[PDB]
Amino acid sequence: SIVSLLGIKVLNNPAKFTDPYEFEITFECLESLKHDLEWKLTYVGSSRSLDHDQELDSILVGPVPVGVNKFVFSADPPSAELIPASELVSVTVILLSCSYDGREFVRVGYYVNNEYDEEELRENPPAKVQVDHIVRNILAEKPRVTRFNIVWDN
């Protein structure tokens, strides 16, 4: 495995639900890569409307040099249209994954705590969700990292 992930810093934590996700990704790379790396951010959270995990955003990391590399993934937030209208899902999940030549080799999973900003709104939750009143807290200090054995260069 050529690209090894070292650390991730969730820079804007906690945040408004509607805020863009800001990750500072640091990985090490042992051989020069012929192509781009692709980082993907997926929203995962319990809903009745069957659901197929929300792909929040994608980003390409340019010509990958050898050594330790740092970058910022500014992912777009989830659309209000694609989250329960009747219930605030208190605990959701965000999946940060990386691909090379169209194959994922790394997946990082985080739990996210979601609650209303107002002291009373938390106690008397409205019939319909106030998206502009949710505050997310990514449990960034505790992620689950998964490696997939993939074909690199040839």
Binding site: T26, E38, D57, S58, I59, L60, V61, G62, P63, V64, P65, G67, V68, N69, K70, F71, V72, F73, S74
Partner: peptide
């Protein structure tokens, strides 16, 4: 699909960078 500039740590300013 958007691109991100990649920073090779070791070489330029970091704390002192304006970007």
């Amino acid at each position: 699909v958007k691109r991100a500039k990649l920073d090779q740590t070791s070489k330029g300013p970091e704390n002192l960078q304006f970007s």
